[PDB]
Structure formats: structure tokens, C-alpha cells
Design a protein around this ligand. Structure first.
Ligand SMILES: *[C@@H]1O[C@H](CO)[C@@H](O[C@@H]2O[C@H](CO)[C@@H](O)[C@H](O)[C@H]2NC(C)=O)[C@H](O)[C@H]1NC(C)=O
Ligand SMILES: *[C@@H]1O[C@H](CO)[C@@H](O)[C@H](O)[C@H]1NC(C)=O
Ligand SMILES: *[C@@H]1O[C@H](CO)[C@@H](O)[C@H](O)[C@H]1NC(C)=O
Ligand SMILES: *[C@@H]1O[C@H](CO)[C@@H](O)[C@H](O)[C@H]1NC(C)=O
Ligand SMILES: *[C@@H]1O[C@H](CO)[C@@H](O)[C@H](O)[C@H]1NC(C)=O
Ligand SMILES: *[C@@H]1O[C@H](CO)[C@@H](O)[C@H](O)[C@H]1NC(C)=O
Lengths: 244, 209
């Protein structure tokens, strides 16, 4: 319900799970959607250690600055992307949510800084920027400015001055063997018909029949002498079925 | 001191049911009639899996700690149990070199960069192994120096960590108000399966003629 400001952006780290990108891509609308390292279509066959999700609200005509190798008030002092980026940026409009008549003064951004930010660095300090050669010792005035401005969002703005919600996903492949990856399938189970079946990995053919054997409650399938699969356990209902 | 296992440290090599079938396997086992250390505690090696039994009606054995350096600068596992329940954890730690009202836990002093969390007489055997970034744990609890008998160990856990391991320890509950360590080698065994599918007997195929 509440996003973060640009100068202090959020960063949620996603653990080892199953990653469903078909909830955001199927969402239908969604503004800017540009993938860089991976292709937008096959996020469902590659997978990485951890994915990061950064969230903030910028202006409309500042969305072009969330891209590797760009410069501006946002790509220098607020949020920088490295030129070897391997995630993807997505952004949509939020005028009917983050904008109030009279002004929504709760979204800040920095516009004065000594040096450009480094990729994925965060700076939330509020010390007084000194533009001249004279010290000012912690009070604004001549040649000393408060570094944080603020968007006065109003609904009667033009596209380009209206609030846009940005989410940046970034993928990570350090060294881990098995990590957060994509998902799988389901299908109803039929019986008493020669069928082509695929039990969470077990691929086979045959007639399936209700069993009367009793596995131990950690065993998936049973084998015969001469080593052929002859029973399985249905993952969902957990019942044993013979395979003839 | 040192003691002699007799037929101990047999685990189900995997899922897949099975009945009366003297099935033959090649795997990492604890050889029959082995030389198991005795402890009444220090940093041990790992080098290839571990058998680990214990006994006590109270609960003095309160989990293990694993890893290569048992400190920061590299990652390690930590498996603990207060009087509540098990707490698996994987961070970079700073471990006491001797880590161990009812107030407790002088175990570590650091919990940085955690990459995995989890929270929630007697003879308690465990087999720990670590293959392809998975840390497998088999276990068995049989109630009454070890004794003599056969009891196969059933798989408990599976953790896709990726962690390197070269050393491990133990954790004990002090006094304020006995355990063994075998090692596993690549052997070939012949397991006898019951009609319900449990391993009732075995043969170590590299002992005598
Ligand atoms: C997988 O999910 C299905 C539902 O999506 C679970 O099916 C439920 O099974 C219980 C039996 O204990 C029934 O009481 C429920 O009504 C079932 N739900 C539905 C929607 O049919 C199934 O149990 C799950 N798998 C496991 C292993 O629990
Ligand atoms: C175990 O090995 C040690 C190594 O010196 C030896 O002293 C001891 O006798 C051995 N124990 C048995 C039961 O063989
Ligand atoms: C038991 O230890 C774990 C280790 O972090 C802790 O989270 C838990 O709170 C402890 N139990 C109680 C009752 O505090
Ligand atoms: C691990 O912790 C150290 C010190 O807290 C930190 O410098 C390092 O960045 C952390 N690792 C990662 C991957 O962030
Ligand atoms: C474990 O340590 C060895 C040291 O020989 C190293 O080569 C290996 O990369 C380490 N494991 C992982 C997963 O990095
Ligand atoms: C288990 O095995 C015993 C003996 O082999 C048998 O009598 C029993 O019917 C089997 N099944 C159980 C106990 O459910």
C-alpha cells in the first residue's frame, strides 16, 4: 500500500522457492517492461541463487534513467545500475494511488551530492551540501542547500510529471548448486486404461490400478526383482497404485 | 577410549519401497566391527560422512555444529535444540572455541549473513553426509558403551545448502543447579528386505572369506 522514496529505496531478497513470473507478465498491463540479460519469455527455464526486488516511486520522465549506462539526477545521486546488469526493470503508472489534490509531499529525492553513486549503493544522509568554499556548520543559507527535494504530486499533472511505481528485479549466480527456480504441472489421474503417465519425474506407460500394499511413509515408488517400477504413490492424495 | 561397533550404521540408501530381496548396494557405510572413538568436547574431522550415537535419559547432547572453519570469513551450519525444539540455521558465525534460571546459549557471538533459517535409557543414532550441495541426515531412536544389534536408520532431512564441510563439533548442557564417532567409507553391502519393506539384516561383503 506504501512504496518507498527514491533516495531510500527498498530491497527485498527472495529465498530459495519456486518463481512464478507468469503472475506479473500475465497481469496484462504494466508500464515499461524491458529485460536486459535474460529474455522476457523464458524466465521459466533458467534460475539463479537469489533475486532482489527494489521498489521506489520516481517521476514519469525519469523512468528512462533506470537503465545501465545512463546519467541524470536519479542515475547519479539516487539509484545506479551497473553496466553488466542481468535482471530486468518494470514500471507502471500510479497516478490514482500516489497522488493527492493539494500535493503529496511524502516522496523525496536527492539532487545535490559530492560524487556520483556507485552501482547498487544507498545514501540516506541528510547533511547540508556545501556549494561554495566557506563552511556553514549545519545550517542552510548562502551556498549551502538541503540535499533532499520532493515531488509535489497532484492528479492534474501531465504524463511525465505523474508518479510511476518502479520494481527492479536482479538475478544472482554466485556458486550455489540448487536454488530458487521455476515451477511444474498436475493433471487428473485415470485408472484401468493403458495411459502415458509422469509421476513427479517417473515417466512411464501402462494401466494404473488401486493397490493394497503399504509403503513406508517416505517411499515413493516400488520396484520388482529385476528392477522394474511396478507401484507408485500419488503425490497429491498419497495412495499406492500398481502399474501393469 | 575406543569401542567396537558390531552391526551399526545401516541406512536406507533411498526411497523406493521393497520387500524380501537380498538387494546389493555400493555406497558409503560404516564397516562392520569398526573402531569407534569414545567420548565422556573437541573439534573433530568430517572427511566423508559420520556415524554418531549417544545415550542419556536427560538431554545433554543438544545438537552439533559443522563447517570448515567454525567461525566467520566462511559459512557454516548450526543445529541446535533448546528445551523447546530444533533450530537449524545457516549464517556466518563467531563460535566460542568451547561453545555450549535455566539460561544458556554461550554458543556463538555472531549471526551474520544468514542464508537459511528454520525454527519450530535412550539410544539416538545419526548418519550425516554431504553430497552435491545437499546435506543429508538419517536418524533412528531405539531405547534400551554401545550394545549389540541391528537397526536401520531412516532418512530425516535434506538441505540444499552448498556449504563446504571439513570439521564438526558437539553441544552439551552444563551443570549449574557418552557418545561415539564413526566414519564412513565406500563399501558394498547385501541388505535383506522384509515383506513390509524394512531392512532386517545385512552382510558386509569385505570382512572375511
Ligand atoms: C495437494 O493439494 C491438493 C489440493 O490442491 C490436496 O488435496 C486435498 O487432500 C485432502 C486430504 O487430506 C482433502 O481433504 C482436500 O479436500 C483436498 N483438496 C482438494 C482441493 O481436493 C493434497 O492433499 C495436496 N497434497 C498433499 C501431499 O497434501
Ligand atoms: C583403534 O585404533 C587405535 C589406534 O592406535 C588402537 O590403539 C586401538 O587398539 C584400536 N581399537 C580396536 C578395537 O582395534
Ligand atoms: C530456542 O532457541 C532458538 C534459537 O534462536 C530461539 O529462536 C528460540 O526463541 C528459543 N526458544 C525460546 C523459548 O526462546
Ligand atoms: C557478509 O557479511 C559481511 C560483513 O557483515 C559483509 O561485508 C558482506 O557483504 C556480506 N556478504 C554479502 C554477500 O553481502
Ligand atoms: C570447497 O573447497 C574446495 C577446496 O579444494 C574448493 O575448491 C571448492 O570450490 C569448495 N566448494 C565450493 C562449492 O565452492
Ligand atoms: C509387518 O511385518 C510383520 C512381520 O513380518 C507382519 O506380521 C505384519 O503383518 C506386517 N505389517 C504391519 C505390522 O502392518
Amino acid at each position: 500500500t506504501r512504496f518507498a522514496s527514491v533516495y531510500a529505496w527498498n530491497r527485498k531478497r527472495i529465498s530459495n522457492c519456486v518463481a512464478d513470473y507468469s503472475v506479473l507478465y500475465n497481469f496484462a498491463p504494466f508500464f515499461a517492461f524491458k529485460c536486459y540479460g535474460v529474455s522476457p519469455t523464458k524466465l521459466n527455464d533458467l534460475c539463479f541463487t537469489n533475486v532482489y526486488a527494489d521498489s521506489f516511486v520516481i517521476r514519469g520522465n525519469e523512468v528512462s534513467q533506470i537503465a545501465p549506462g545512463q546519467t541524470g539526477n536519479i542515475a547519479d545521486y539516487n539509484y545506479k545500475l551497473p553496466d553488466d546488469f542481468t535482471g530486468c526493470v518494470i514500471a507502471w503508472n500510479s497516478n490514482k494511488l500516489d497522488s493527492k489534490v493539494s500535493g503529496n509531499y511524502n516522496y523525496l529525492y536527492r539532487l545535490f551530492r559530492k560524487s556520483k553513486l556507485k552501482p547498487f549503493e544507498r545514501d540516506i544522509s541528510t547533511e547540508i551540501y556545501q556549494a561554495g568554499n566557506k563552511p556553514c556548520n549545519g545550517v542552510a543559507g548562502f551556498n549551502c542547500y538541503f540535499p533532499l527535494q520532493s515531488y509535489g504530486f497532484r492528479p492534474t499533472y501531465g504524463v511525465g510529471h505523474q508518479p510511476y511505481r518502479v520494481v527492479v528485479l536482479s538475478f544472482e549466480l554466485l556458486h550455489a548448486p540448487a536454488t530458487v527456480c521455476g515451477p511444474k504441472k498436475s493433471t487428473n489421474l485415470v485408472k484401468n486404461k493403458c495411459v502415458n503417465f509422469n509421476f513427479n519425474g517417473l515417466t512411464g506407460t501402462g494401466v494404473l490400478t488401486e493397490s493394497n500394499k503399504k509403503f513406508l511413509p517416505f517411499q515413493q515408488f516400488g520396484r520388482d526383482i529385476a528392477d522394474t517400477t511396478d507401484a507408485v504413490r500419488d503425490p497429491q492424495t498419497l495412495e499406492i497404485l500398481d502399474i501393469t | 577410549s575406543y569401542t567396537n561397533s558390531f552391526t551399526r550404521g545401516v541406512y536406507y540408501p533411498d526411497k523406493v519401497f521393497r520387500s524380501s530381496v537380498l538387494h546389493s548396494t555400493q555406497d558409503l557405510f560404516l564397516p562392520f566391527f569398526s573402531n569407534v572413538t569414545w567420548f565422556h568436547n573437541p573439534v573433530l574431522p568430517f572427511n566423508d560422512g559420520v556415524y554418531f550415537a549417544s545415550t542419556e535419559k536427560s538431554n545433554i547432547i543438544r545438537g552439533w555444529i559443522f563447517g570448515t572453519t567454525l567461525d566467520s570469513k566462511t559459512q557454516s551450519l548450526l543445529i541446535v535444540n533448546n528445551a523447546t525444539n530444533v533450530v537449524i540455521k545457516v549464517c556466518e558465525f563467531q563460535f566460542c572455541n568451547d561453545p555450549f534460571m535455566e539460561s544458556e546459549l554461550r554458543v556463538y557471538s555472531s549471526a551474520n549473513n544468514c542464508t537459511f533459517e528454520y525454527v519450530s535409557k535412550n539410544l539416538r543414532e545419526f548418519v550425516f553426509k554431504n553430497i552435491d550441495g545437499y546435506f543429508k541426515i538419517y536418524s533412528k531412536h531405539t531405547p534400551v558403551d554401545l550394545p549389540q544389534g541391528f537397526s536401520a536408520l531412516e532418512p530425516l532431512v535434506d538441505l540444499p545448502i552448498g556449504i563446504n564441510i571439513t570439521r564438526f563439533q558437539t553441544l552439551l548442557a552444563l551443570h549449574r543447579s557418552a557418545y561415539y564417532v564413526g566414519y564412513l567409507q565406500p563399501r558394498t553391502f547385501l541388505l535383506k528386505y522384509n515383506e513390509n519393506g524394512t531392512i532386517t539384516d545385512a552382510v558386509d561383503c569385505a570382512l572375511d572369506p
